[PDB]
Amino acid sequence: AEEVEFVVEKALSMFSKMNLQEIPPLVYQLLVLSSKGSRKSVLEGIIAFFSALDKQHNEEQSGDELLDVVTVPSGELRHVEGTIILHIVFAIKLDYELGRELVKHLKVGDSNNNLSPFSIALLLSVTRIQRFQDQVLDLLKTSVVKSFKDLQLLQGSKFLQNLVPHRSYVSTMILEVVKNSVHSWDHVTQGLVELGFILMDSYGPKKVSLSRMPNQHACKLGANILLETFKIHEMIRQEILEQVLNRVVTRASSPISHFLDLLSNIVMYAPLVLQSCSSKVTEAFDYLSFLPLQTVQRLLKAVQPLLKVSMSMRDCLILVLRKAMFANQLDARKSAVAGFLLLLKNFKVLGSLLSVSQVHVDVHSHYNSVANETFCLEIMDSLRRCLSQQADVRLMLYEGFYDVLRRNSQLANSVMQTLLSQLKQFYEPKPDLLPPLKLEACILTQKISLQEPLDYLLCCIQHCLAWYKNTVIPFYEDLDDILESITNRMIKSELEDFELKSADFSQSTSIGIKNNICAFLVMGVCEVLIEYNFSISSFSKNRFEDILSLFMCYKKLSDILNEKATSDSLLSMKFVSSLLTALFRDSIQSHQESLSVLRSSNEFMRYAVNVALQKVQQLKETGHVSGPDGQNPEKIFQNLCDITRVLLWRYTSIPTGKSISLLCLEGLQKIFSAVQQFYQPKIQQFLRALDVSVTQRTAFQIRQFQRSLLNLLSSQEEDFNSKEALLLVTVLTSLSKLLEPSSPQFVQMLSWTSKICKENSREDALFCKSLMNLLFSLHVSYKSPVILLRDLSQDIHGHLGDIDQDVEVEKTNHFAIVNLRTAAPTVCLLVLSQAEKVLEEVDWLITKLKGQVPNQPVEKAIIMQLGTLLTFFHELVQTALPSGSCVDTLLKDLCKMYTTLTALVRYYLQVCQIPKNMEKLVKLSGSHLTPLCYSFISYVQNKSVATAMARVLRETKPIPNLIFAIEQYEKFLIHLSKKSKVNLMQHMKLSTSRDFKIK
Amino acid sequence: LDPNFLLKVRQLVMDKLSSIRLEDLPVIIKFILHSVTAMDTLEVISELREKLDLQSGQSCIILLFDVIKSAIRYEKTISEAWIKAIENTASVSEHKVFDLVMLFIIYSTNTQTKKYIDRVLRNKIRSGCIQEQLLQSTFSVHYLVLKDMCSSILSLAQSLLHSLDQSIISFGSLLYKYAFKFFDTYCQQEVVGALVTHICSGNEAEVDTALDVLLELVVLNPSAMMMNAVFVKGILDYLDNISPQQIRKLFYVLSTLAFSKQNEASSHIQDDMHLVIRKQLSSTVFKYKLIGIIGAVTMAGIMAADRLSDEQCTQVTSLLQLVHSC
Amino acid sequence: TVKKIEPGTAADSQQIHEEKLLYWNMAVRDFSILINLIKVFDSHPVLHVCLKYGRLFVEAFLKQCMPLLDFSFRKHREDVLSLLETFQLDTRLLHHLCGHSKIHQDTRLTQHVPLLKKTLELLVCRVKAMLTLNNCREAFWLGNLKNRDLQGEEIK
Amino acid sequence: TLFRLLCRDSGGETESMLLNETVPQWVIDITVDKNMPKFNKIPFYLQPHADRLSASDMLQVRKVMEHVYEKILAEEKIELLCQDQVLDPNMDLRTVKHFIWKSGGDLTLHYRQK
């Protein structure tokens, strides 16, 4: 055993001396020799040599392509690595002990510094052995997740970030394994594809906080792995596309959003897809009829880049979709309607340019515009026949005709005749009969349901007509006449001609359900005509008086339905942005006289702002907006900028159901959250459109909201607008995330929040909780909050008193926000959560530090953190906390405090073959924490169906858990006192025990 | 249609499922499987598991499974719901041929359930739910549908053989033997190639078990193993990581296969085995000299086994004279 | 033997509950005699056995006897208090044994102390849970026991 | 032959639709995505005539001359040699490897002061 150890070790010396091309011959002989001798040292040496060899090559490769000092060229380096990996893999196929050593050597929570691009590529090729397939792939999955947890933990702390020099991450490591796999590493791809699918299956979004972000990163890595492997390796792409389509083409209604983005990215290389894997798309197209409507629309939008460039795929899609049209089975014509709508709103040119002995002939015929127009018109005629189907099918067509009419201008006439004819079925052309529309004809009774979305039909007509009269001009003269007729007759309607103040309006009776459904249609019609009368005749008084009367018709029926007991607004986002701008910040004498009609109605102000809030909320929930151009991120972003400017101006210009200014502040909070969530790269352009860098513009907005909060605080307690103050802090919290922490602007935000917390003593607990959470979020990214935590504990101790009931605790009054009512359970629960974060950071250092063996600077910082956190706990362990969750959380946190102390002692137990600071920390814990923990336990216990048994058996855990933690700590202090020959138990008193004795 | 009205007609559809003909079984089931919602999946599939008996007759059964394979091809929930029905069952009597056939179909068709099928299979075998007779009956009468997925079955058999429980190991060995017996020539070569990998793996448990399977295959079907001798001969190149006890067994199966028949194919292997040992007996390496003695004594046992002409008697005698001299 | 005594249910015969309670009292007396023998035999192998198996006896007590005490505390009150009071004398000697192990810093002995201390305190909290289930929370009251030697000499 | 056309006819409606289906990815990368192809790299040895370096194939001998000069006006003082032959300052490494080198190993260049 010793003799074979020397011969291999001497050969590892030859690794750095012998030529690179000579290594693989040496490895094979030394690997097979390892069968009868040492096994771990053989694999560890090969892995260590190439890990440093690759690292040295990476360092020297970076730089200009001008003359460089390169030892090993990348071409031969990947060749020797690739053939040596195959040598190791072949050895495992005959040994099974070398493979177990490799997994055990590369076992991961710990950073696992032995992981490298060479070792990861070695592990991936090992997965070709079915025995080690699941075992190795589980190792790689755990490594990336832990690596992302480490990355998230470092970025969220400044204390932790200073002490840890940066290290590479497994996610970065695997990506360059894919990059290096181009050099004939075909033995890696199969395990590389399997790992990418495991990462995306195990950590895909299951929507159907702390751990959600690292899970999203692991899923993204799988998509990056699968996408990059698709481009490089031609023989694995057909398996990637087939597996991707398997998770997407289902009726299981499982969350597949991540899979659809990967499929959309793969088909961006359409010629790359058509060359090898094109049948998989065609078989997927065959199942489109059986898929649900939601799946078909999302699947077709994913393979849209493929359809844009390829004629055969469009021909295959049309061929399949045409069958679904003629298919008698329902729920499949719905997918055909979606297929034609998506295909007709995106492509101006459609159409092409068999039996056993039937072949296709390449006819060289020029493209005919007339033939294409006839082809497109025939499809629209097939869509017109679908306006007699279920209300769901009509809804898609109304939403889709506007996009179709904007893409294909030749079909504009077909749309209007199709739309006008449908309106005639419900429009009363008699110039004096009321109501203007036959609301009973839109209802299907068989159970009373809705047959025709008449309000959505009018919305499509109004938008399509508006586009018509401004685009194709440089039926239409009759469409304005009808809409004008509907406008006037709806206003003079007495709200009884609809058979609607309260007849039944119930949710169970048939007539009640019909009235509720009919109530939505008339309100939706009012919204559409409000949009219509705004643009026509420009800013004329008479039309605006008709909007207010139309709104009152909508508002009155909205009130009656709300009080007895919703739906989206039919206004487009562009109109809401345009309406708000004129309604608040338009100053032109011609416009002023007409706009005074709309500005005088306060309820119209509520409606206009609230609809804008609805539009923003749809963006956050869904990612797109309901109205026209509601799935175009560029136009949504432009509308957010204009809406923000109006809401920002209104809130700042005039201070204060809810008032208009409060509504504008509420909308501002949603927009800031929505902009950062979706339009992350447009933040500089978003802040630019409000009237340097992101930090300078953000600070200007931040200081604007800072002054507003100062005015609320400066007022009296009864006048303190709690709702606005919390909403202001939410705005400041979101904006402060944009500042760079290493900047004078960030320091001012931290310095302003600290001053507010130290001087204001509001009685509202929700405001205090939000303000302190802002202070701690800012502070943690600046420095360790242990000093801040220690000062807050002294305030909680001062207000709530001491458990001794015979000594007086002096009131520090470090922060005025920590008053007698907010001290518990608001500040106490808040600081305990922050101290729990501090312990999780320190315990991460010790784990990283212990597994490592700069041991000197990290040890001092850890001891300094635990030394300060001891004083924080020393204050709370002798506070008369209420019997609720404050005691339970402190007991659980004290257990975490002692667990971390034990982990530190066990570290020095491993290293001591004891500095003065560690001496003082052990002495400090035994003089200020341990004796007072026993006093707290006595304090807590003395003062005071099947679920009752559960509650009492749950209450019996926390105190024994702490006693175990203290005794476990003193056990390892005895072990350290023996190894280090210094008695650490002289600092510790004797353990105090309790005896129950019933009265 | 009305969900309640659709439920009632589907219940009547499955009510008389036993009394219907054979050719309509695909289309009637084709209706039911698509007539499944998210919540109703578990309850419907459990009924269909028991309401189905299955006891152009050979073709229509294949058509039935072809419909099911297409029906669950894009449906993971239905495939997963089938296994839950089998997992919940705790009585051996309920398990039938149709039960085992479906469990293999889900394995081959959908790869997202490889692990879940494996874990449940271990429990059923270990608890005695799945028996040799159920496996024997499954292959015997429904090898037409199983033959399509011989690669999938052998991957399942190979994984079962890596276990540490004799019940699982015995079943995995049986899965190898039944695949060799009922499938075609190409999948038989896969069976032998899979066994050779186990013998060269290094595990004492796998090498011992795989050698027993090879001996059973030789005794059962010497003619089929006769043309697979090239791969079996390849194990002789990896005698370094094989114990002397297993070397004796490896020579026994090689010797009993070479002398099973008197055809011209055997005579090529017989003289091939003589020369392999002849060049091991004379090897300067001492370990291979001992391997030659073990192999030559083993061959002489089959050579002189009593059930022998003079020319055979002098041939085995000459082999012993060679071993004595070396 | 103690692990095999089930608490049964509250709907069993009163004599059955009385018999089990009498059975538990004998087990505690036998435990008391065995534990008290560490005063004369105070070698490490004896203390290791007493320290290791004292924890297991207490764990079985609060898992098997405590549910029985929940069922029968109103009808049987003097017996339950007598059983708990006598068992309290035994647990005090377990505490002194834990202190004795830590004072002499015997690594082989102190490696059982943390788990026995948790179960010793878990018993104390379990008694209070019993009183709450019988609406006697105000009857519960703790006190700090004096640290004693193995012989019984106070450590101060 | 997948598709044949004249150069000027690519703009037509029929040809453009046909080009989208026939043009392969390796032509799309350069003509549409405007990506830049790889730069081939030729490593070589600098040794004193009596430290491996990797450079672009297009690198001139002058660049290698000045690198040695900084290691130890550059044109006048330093003459580079290969196979005991003088190297033209304007000649590139790619040409040197092909004509003068006449060997199957990494190109070796020898530097000596003029």
How would you concisely characterize the structure shown here?
The structure is cut from a larger assembly and holds 1 copy of chain A (999 residues), 2 copies of chain B and 1 copy of chain D (114 residues). Chain A is mainly alpha-helical and 999 residues long. By secondary structure, chain D is of the alpha+beta class.
What tags apply to this protein structure?
part of a larger assembly, 4 chains, A: mainly alpha, two-stranded antiparallel ribbon, 44 helices, D: 114 residues, alpha+beta, five-stranded mixed β-sheet, 5 strands, 24% strand, elongated, WD repeat-containing protein 48 (chain D), Fanconi anemia group D2 protein (chain C), phosphoprotein (chain A)
Topology:
This is part of a larger assembly, with one copy of chain A (999 residues), two copies of chain B and one copy of chain D (114 residues).
Chain A: H1 2-15, H2 23-33, H3 40-61, H4 74-95, H5 97-105, H6 117-126, H7 133-155, H8 159-163, H9 170-180, H10 186-202, H11 212-232, H12 237-248, H13 257-266, H14 270-276, H15 279-286, H16 293-302, H17 304-309, H18 311-326, H19 333-344, H20 369-384, H21 391-407, H22 412-424, E1 443-445, E2 448-450, H23 454-471, H24 476-492, H25 510-535, H26 541-564, H27 573-585, H28 589-600, H29 602-622, H30 633-653, H31 660-678, H32 683-688, H33 694-714, H34 722-736, H35 744-759, H36 765-780, H37 786-800, H38 823-852, H39 855-876, H40 885-911, H41 916-928, H42 930-942, H43 946-955, H44 958-979, E3 994-996
Antiparallel strand pairs in A: 1-2
Chain B: H1 3-15, H2 24-34, H3 40-51, H4 57-71, H5 76-88, H6 97-109, H7 114-126, H8 132-141, H9 143-146, H10 150-161, H11 166-182, H12 185-199, H13 204-220, H14 222-226, H15 229-233, H16 244-258, H17 264-281, H18 286-303, H19 310-325
Helix pairs in contact in B: 2-4, 3-5, 5-6, 6-8, 8-11, 10-11, 10-12, 11-12, 11-13, 12-13, 13-16, 16-17, 16-18, 17-18, 18-19
Chain D: H1 13-22, H2 25-31, E1 41-48, E2 52-56, H3 61-71, H4 74-77, E3 78-82, E4 85-86, H5 93-98, E5 107-113
Parallel strand pairs in D: 1-5
Antiparallel strand pairs in D: 1-2, 3-4, 3-5
Would you kindly provide a written description of the structure presented here, covering whatever features stand out?
This is part of a larger assembly, with one copy of chain A (999 residues), two copies of chain B and one copy of chain D (114 residues). Helix content of chain A is 69%, strand content 1%. Chain A contains 44 helices and three strands. A two-stranded antiparallel sheet of chain A has the order 1-2. Chain A is globular, with a radius of gyration of 36 Å. Chain B is mainly alpha-helical. Chain B has helices at 3-15, 24-34, 40-51, 57-71, 76-88, 97-109, 114-126, 132-141, 143-146, 150-161, 166-182, 185-199, 204-220, 222-226, 229-233, 244-258, 264-281, 286-303, 310-325. The radius of gyration of chain B is 25 Å and the shape is elongated. The termini of chain B are far apart. With 114 residues, chain D is an alpha+beta fold. Chain D has five helices and five strands; from the N terminus they run H-H-E-E-H-H-E-E-H-E. Chain D has a five-stranded mixed β-sheet. In chain D, a hairpin with a 3-residue loop joins strand 1 and strand 2. The longest helix of chain D is centred in the middle third of the chain and has 11 residues, at 61-71. The chains are: A mainly alpha (999), B mainly alpha (326), D alpha+beta (114). Chains in contact: A-B, A-C, A-D. Chain A binds chain B through residues 35, 93-97, 130-131, 134, 201, 243, 246, 249-254, 287, 290, and chain B through 34, 38, 74-77, 111-112, 115, 155, 158-159, 162, 197, 200-203, 238, 240-241.
